[PDB]
Amino acid sequence: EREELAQQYEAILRECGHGRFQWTLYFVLGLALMADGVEVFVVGFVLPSGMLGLIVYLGMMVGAFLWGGLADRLGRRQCLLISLSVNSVFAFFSSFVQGYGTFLFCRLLSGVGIGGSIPIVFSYFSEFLAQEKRGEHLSWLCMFWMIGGVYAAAMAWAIIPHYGWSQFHSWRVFVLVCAFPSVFAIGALTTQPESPRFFLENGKHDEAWMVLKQVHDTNMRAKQRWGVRALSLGGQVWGNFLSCFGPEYRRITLMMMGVWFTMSFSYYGLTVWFPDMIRHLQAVDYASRGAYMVYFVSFLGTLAVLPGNIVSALLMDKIGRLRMLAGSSVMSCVSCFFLSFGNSESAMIALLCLFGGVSIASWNALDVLTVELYPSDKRTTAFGFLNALCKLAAVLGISIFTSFVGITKAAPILFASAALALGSSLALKLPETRG
Ligand SMILES: COCc1nn2c(CN3C[C@@H](CCC(F)(F)F)CC3=O)c(C(F)(F)F)nc2s1
Numbered sequence: 001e002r003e004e005l006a007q008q009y010e011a012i013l014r015e016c017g018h019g020r021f022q023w024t025l026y027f028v029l030g031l032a033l034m035a036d037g038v039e040v041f042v043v044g045f046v047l048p049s050g051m052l053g054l055i056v057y058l059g060m061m062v063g064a065f066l067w068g069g070l071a072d073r074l075g076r077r078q079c080l081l082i083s084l085s086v087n088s089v090f091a092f093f094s095s096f097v098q099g100y101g102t103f104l105f106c107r108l109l110s111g112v113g114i115g116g117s118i119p120i121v122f123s124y125f126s127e128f129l130a131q132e133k134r135g136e137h138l139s140w141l142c143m144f145w146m147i148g149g150v151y152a153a154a155m156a157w158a159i160i161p162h163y164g165w166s167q168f169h170s171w172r173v174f175v176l177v178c179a180f181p182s183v184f185a186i187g188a189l190t191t192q193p194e195s196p197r198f199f200l201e202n203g204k205h206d207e208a209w210m211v212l213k214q215v216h217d218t219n220m221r222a223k224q225r226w227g228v229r230a231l232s233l234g235g236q237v238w239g240n241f242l243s244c245f246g247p248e249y250r251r252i253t254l255m256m257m258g259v260w261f262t263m264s265f266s267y268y269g270l271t272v273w274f275p276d277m278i279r280h281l282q283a284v285d286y287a288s289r290g291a292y293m294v295y296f297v298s299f300l301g302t303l304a305v306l307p308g309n310i311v312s313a314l315l316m317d318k319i320g321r322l323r324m325l326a327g328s329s330v331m332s333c334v335s336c337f338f339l340s341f342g343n344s345e346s347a348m349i350a351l352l353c354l355f356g357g358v359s360i361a362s363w364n365a366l367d368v369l370t371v372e373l374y375p376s377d378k379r380t381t382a383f384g385f386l387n388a389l390c391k392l393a394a395v396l397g398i399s400i401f402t403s404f405v406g407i408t409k410a411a412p413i414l415f416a417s418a419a420l421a422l423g424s425s426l427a428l429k430l431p432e433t434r435g
Pocket of ligand 1: 118141142143145146260264267305355356357358359360361363364367386387390391
């Protein structure tokens, strides 16, 4: 069967152990995730400078599902290469455009390219990690999203600190420097093999043996008519997506959808309500008598997330994944309640940092759970579907929370708190990755 092969694969991985190969691949996929973080920041904060920049999220969901589904039939390295190439190509194109139409079309296609970054990188990394400590290592890899977010925030604060709302223009230079991480990720990933789990599942056992030999050698330095092809490939992708909701994985997938949607909705609503709330406070304080404030707030908020991820990774395996996920979701809800006490910009930044640092642990734990609960034959399909669900949640939360801006700080707080409470409730029902 396929369960007995998993035990053999885990035995080979454990016998080899961690080493150079895993860390090199860790940095490669870290660059790949840095690209995704950069694009998320760019869409969330830079593109509006109005509401029509959400097209990039709406394309990120499509790309996430498409690349996740394809990665099971074609490969994690090949499909990640294709997706990162699309993202880099269109991010590079965006710089030379001369209007918002072409600019947003290029950003939409680059978002389609980068949508499948997270699913494929997480499945691809988890397929090289032994069960002994893969939670801590996936949590370590989660850091690179924060690195990319802070990188983009710093480059925006340094390059274009002024609004477009009243390579030559500063924003074009910012665009291409933000595209750089994708190019570095592609260049790094071209030097990596293909995950042997995918080869073994497809039937290329000899290629899986070659990949495992490469891993061991690297670690040893330590211690129309023809259109039926596309039609059938899409058919396999659809069949895997439908099997994710089969007699088994239906309850698991529904719980995963609920928790992922709650987390993403809350986070993406709040991180767009925070700079807007601070800016409205500044406006009313100047009335009590240009854009680099948003980028500085984003830089601080995404930088504050990194200590939380340091603590999460070191404690992911010592404590667990259900315990971490629950103790992070309820703490995120509590911090959403605390958001009321942020009655001034000074406190608003501190509460934003607190919320991010508290919440990163639930995302780490849920990554590990979603890669440990789905077999390799549907890991990337389900992960890409849930990433598309998260992007839709991000669009919905951004829209709602930006509609709340300047009216009341209790509606965003209660929306996020209810979302996180429902997410924590559904997370408590998630089965332990063990079963
Ligand atoms: C989109 O849903 C599938 C996944 N997305 N995703 C991410 C990307 N992040 C990090 C989150 C930070 C929340 C807060 F508040 F803690 F900072 C926001 C987001 O989108 C990661 C990680 F970056 F952590 F590696 N892991 C996965 S799975």
